[PDB]
Write a protein that binds this ligand. Structure first.
Ligand SMILES: O=P(O)(O)OC[C@H]1O[C@@H](O)[C@H](O)[C@@H](O)[C@@H]1O
Ligand SMILES: O=P(O)(O)OC[C@H]1O[C@@H](O)[C@H](O)[C@@H](O)[C@@H]1O
Ligand SMILES: OC[C@H]1O[C@@H](O)[C@H](O)[C@@H](O)[C@@H]1O
Ligand SMILES: OC[C@H]1O[C@@H](O)[C@H](O)[C@@H](O)[C@@H]1O
Length: 902
């Protein structure tokens, strides 16, 4: 063997002399550690820019958010299908989780790849059909995971908008589109089987998930093959594009694009540039074309040519295979760099290229292979180094212990790459005990690991939707609901039908809008809403001076006695008279009693039945005007003239009509809901008389107490009503007013919570607290100006331990309910305007509506949706809504003016 030894010395001798010369020729491809630190530092800056919302729009390193928040924990179970496309092979596996997987490779020729997105996806679908056939699972409904090795935009995990083609693929009409849906079109065109792509993940994510399944220290996913890329677990609080602050989420770096903006124009060489000039994506993936094992061999080829041309190789002799693009590939690079086998391989290959390689040439082309595969390994060490620093920092520790899961041919196959990369890495990041785990099995197993979870969520999101589905009414139902009210309106206005009508159409003896001749000083009560207040209104024919003071009524008095309740009112009145300096002279009062009252004239008003929060005994069936008088007596302090008993709708209508003659309808949407309008007397059957109109206090909150709305009432609606004071009463109102909506939302959440869909399945005392969701908060929650952070805060403020996810669902629930309300109220209001256009027999109506109520006033959407609904439900009308800013008081004064007038 003194021969082999003898030879080896010969080559080293031969080698030595040449190496110096080549190192100086390709000096540009000799990146010092210093430079590598520089590149490591530049990459950091690029990573910070991709995560930053401020800088992300022009950041080359996309730092795309995948929707994976943690590596496998063993909770995963089931048999899935995995599609792997973009690597070196198009495999279709069937993982079943121990983890049992079955792969299959399908050839994807240079016609499908560079073809049409349709052709491509038709190929993917066919192969999938083949697999499922072969495998005998087409019957079984199995979840599909898609390992798509390209840059995509995902908002959810089953969303995957292609940004740009990478590596070898370039099919027309895919970029910009949702690959998932594109895949579905193919499977449906074929209409062979049924498939649900529940997840779409990158191969670095898939590799990371795969390794983490085996090693729980796994936080990175690296790929060095047809293309290079890396992903890692990043803290949510830093992922600006995703709203959350708790936990981490995997970030698909897409580092191949590093340098695309020009950041590596000082590193990149003339060879890298020409390699680019003839590539499928000129100017893109620049960092990748210097590292990847799809660009490597061709890079060596471009160097060989340059030197041969310059007579520095094969005595300047060129051959046409040396010039043909792709004659020299990365496998040639790997072999030529083999330990013992290297030099002869260089020969066997180089002669295949037609140049008569000398022993010198073989020794040179091997060194040329080292500089190029080494620059590659050093560049990945640098950028991975940065990811490692970023991880260390996120940990706050000065030392890092993590695991990077690798995969990829160049790494897995080149004889010098792996260790050179390793050594260089740890010299750059000496502050870490980085391990590397090679995904021996491939990406599929990890994608199944993602698909298992994506599926689970997709499943629970489906049940939630089976719930909310109910608070979503079709225009056709809003149309019937409208038609249903109109029938009811007829039943209370008509003699015979009246006693049966649930929507009683109460005659308020207000026969006209302010005639501008009103004058005087009137006292006025406003009871029923949220704030009970006593007012003094000084009208003068034309000027209205107002004054008021809120007097709170305890829940106890409010639900006390007819006496306790009414004695309390008089005392407040007593105080107000003092407060005003009006005490003494008997004054004309206008009682705004916001409740169902049977009147036969202004000055009387028998409480038909309490609604909302009042439940004071011995009050129903009595003339409230009368009760007010007895209370004044028992007191024996002052006296007053109970001139009128008006409802708040009527009062609101007048307050607005005073300024706007066109206002003939009054709407209230606050603690409770109701409306009123100027009905033609010809129709007011309950009241004898034939001329003019009469304001009908449509007690619409009862619409449905007979059952005509029982097709749209949900089991949640039943509950609220069941747990209320007036159980079975005020249904239409119970699904619209601010005293009820919160309770609907609260019972849904309790439901979702029991299902584990929310607040981690635990029903907190606050969750069980009635009225926890006030009009003040619903309005806030449902606000768009409010960030998610803020919505989460309110909910935490309410005492509920919400997460950002809870904060989203809660927010969703509130919108389904308030929308349904704004819609239902719009249907009723729509009916009212038909009857007005029809009663006055006109082709087209222009009427104004006076509105008041905290919900209508505070809520961000209600009014807006409601306005649209009335518009779309009743096209022959142009309803205008006027917000009442002076309360029912002013209007109640104008009523007592004319009320005192007789
Ligand atoms: O370019 P490659 O050698 O195919 O490397 C990338 C590919 O590696 C395979 O082992 C994985 O299963 C694929 O999910 C990945 O896309
Ligand atoms: O529930 P609320 O906010 O009190 O809405 C209804 C109330 O609105 C006030 O503005 C009116 O002055 C009251 O007469 C009415 O009863
Ligand atoms: O296949 C490995 C990687 O190659 C890159 O060039 C692609 O852009 C990545 O999306 C992919 O993860
Ligand atoms: O407060 C607005 C409405 O609330 C309902 O609960 C009452 O029954 C109505 O009479 C009133 O108009």
């Amino acid at each position: 063997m003194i021969a082999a030894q003898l030879l080896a010395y010969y080559f080293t001798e031969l080698k030595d002399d040449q190496v110096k010369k080549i190192d100086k020729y390709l000096y540009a491809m000799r990146l010092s550690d210093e430079i590598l630190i520089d590149i490591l530092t530049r990459f950091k800056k690029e990573m910070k820019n991709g995560l930053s919302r401020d800088y992300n729009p022009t950041a080359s390193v996309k730092m795309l958010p995948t929707f994976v928040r943690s590596i496998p924990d063993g909770s995963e179970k089931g048999d899935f299908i995995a599609l792997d496309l973009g690597g070196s092979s198009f495999r279709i596996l069937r993982v079943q989780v121990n983890v049992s997987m079955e792969s299959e490779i399908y050839d994807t020729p240079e016609n499908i790849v560079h073809g049409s997105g349709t052709q491509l996806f038709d190929h993917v679908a066919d192969c999938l059909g083949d697999f499922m056939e072969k495998k005998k699972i087409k019957d079984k409904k199995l979840p599909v995971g898609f390992t798509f090795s390209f840059p995509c935009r995902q908002s959810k995990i089953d969303e995957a908008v292609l940004i740009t083609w990478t590596k070898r693929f370039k099919a027309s009409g895919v970029e910009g589109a949702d690959v998932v849906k594109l895949l579905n079109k193919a499977i449906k065109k074929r209409g062979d089987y049924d498939a649900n792509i529940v997840a779409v993940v990158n191969d670095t994510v898939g590799t990371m998930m795969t390794c983490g399944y085996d090693d729980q220290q796994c936080e990175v996913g690296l790929i060095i093959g047809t293309g290079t890329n890396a992903c890692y677990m990043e803290e949510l609080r830093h992922i600006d594009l995703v709203e959350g602050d708790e936990g981490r989420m995997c970030i698909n770096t897409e580092w191949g694009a590093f340098g695309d903006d020009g950041s590596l124009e000082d590193i990149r060489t003339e060879f890298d540039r020409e390699l680019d000039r003839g590539s499928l994506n000129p100017g893109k993936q620049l960092f990748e074309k210097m590292v990847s094992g799809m660009y490597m061999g061709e890079l060596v080829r471009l160097i060989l040519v340059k030197m041969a041309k310059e007579g520095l190789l094969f005595e300047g002799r060129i051959t046409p295979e040396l010039l043909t693009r792709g004659k020299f590939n990365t496998s040639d690079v790997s072999a030529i760099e083999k330990d013992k086998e290297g030099i002869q391989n260089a020969k066997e290959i180089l002669t295949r290229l037609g140049v008569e390689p000398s022993d010198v040439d073989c020794v040179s082309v091997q060194h040329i292979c080292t500089i190029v595969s080494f620059r590659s390994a050093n560049l990945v060490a640098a950028t991975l180094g940065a990811i490692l620093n970023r991880l260390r920092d996120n940990k706050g520790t000065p030392r890092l212990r993590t695991t990077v899961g690798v995969d990829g041919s160049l790494y897995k196959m080149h004889p010098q790459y792996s260790r050179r990369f390793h050594k260089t890495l740890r010299r750059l990041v000496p502050d870490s005990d980085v391990r590397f785990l090679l995904s021996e099995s491939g990406t599929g197993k990890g994608a199944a690991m993602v698909t298992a979870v994506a599926y689970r969520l997709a499943e629970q999101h489906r049940q939630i939707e089976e719930t909310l589905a109910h608070f979503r009414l079709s225009k056709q139902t809003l149309m019937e609901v409208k038609k249903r009210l109109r029938t009811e309106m007829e039943m209370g206005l008509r003699k015979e039908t009246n006693s049966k009508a649930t929507v009683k159409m109460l005659p308020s003896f207000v026969r006209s809008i302010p005639d501008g001749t009103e004058h005087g000083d009137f006292l006025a009560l406003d009871l029923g809403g949220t704030n009970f207040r006593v007012l003094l209104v000084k009208i003068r024919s034309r000027t209205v001076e107002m004054h008021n003071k809120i007097y709170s009524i305890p829940l106890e008095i409010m639900q006390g006695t007819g006496d306790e309740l009414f004695d309390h009112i008089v005392s407040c009145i007593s105080d107000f008279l003092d407060y005003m300096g009006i005490k003494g002279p008997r004054m004309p009062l206008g009682f705004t009693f916001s409740f169902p009252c049977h009147q036969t004239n202004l000055d009387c008003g028998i409480l038909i039945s309490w609604t909302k929060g009042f439940k004071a005994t011995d009050c129903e069936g009595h003339d409230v005007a009368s009760l007010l008088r007895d209370a004044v007596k028992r007191r024996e302090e002052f006296d007053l003239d109970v001139v009128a008993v008006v409802n708040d709708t009527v009062g609101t209508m007048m307050t607005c009509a005073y300024e706007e003659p066109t206002c003939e309808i009054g709407l209230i949407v606050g603690t409770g809901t109701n409306a009123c309008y100027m009905e033609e007397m010809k129709n007011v059957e309950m009241v004898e008389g034939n001329q003019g109109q009469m304001c009908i206090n449509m007690e619409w909150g009862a619409f449905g107490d007979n059952g005509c709305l029982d097709d749209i009432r949900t089991d949640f609606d039943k509950v609220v009503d069941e747990y209320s004071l007036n159980s079975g009463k005020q249904r239409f109102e119970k699904m619209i007013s601010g005293m009820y909506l919160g309770e609907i939302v609260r019972n849904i959440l309790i439901d979702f919570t029991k299902k584990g869909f929310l607040f981690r399945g635990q029903i907190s005392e606050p969750l069980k607290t009635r009225g926890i969701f006030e009009t003040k908060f619903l309005s806030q929650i449902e606000s768009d100006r409010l960030a998610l952070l803020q919505v989460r805060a309110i909910l935490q403020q309410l005492g509920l331990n919400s997460t950002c996810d809870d904060s989203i669902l809660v927010k969703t629930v509130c919108g389904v309910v308030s929308k349904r309300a704004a819609q239902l109220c719009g249907a009723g209001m729509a009916a009212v305007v038909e009857k007005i256009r029809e009663n006055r027999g006109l082709d087209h109506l222009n009427v104004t509506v006076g509105v008041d109520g905290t919900l209508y006033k505070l809520h961000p959407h209600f009014s807006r949706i409601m306005h649209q609904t009335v518009k779309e439900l009743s096209p022959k009308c142009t309803v205008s809504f006027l917000l009442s800013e002076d309360g029912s008081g002013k209007g109640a004064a104008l009523i007592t003016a004319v009320g005192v007038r007789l």
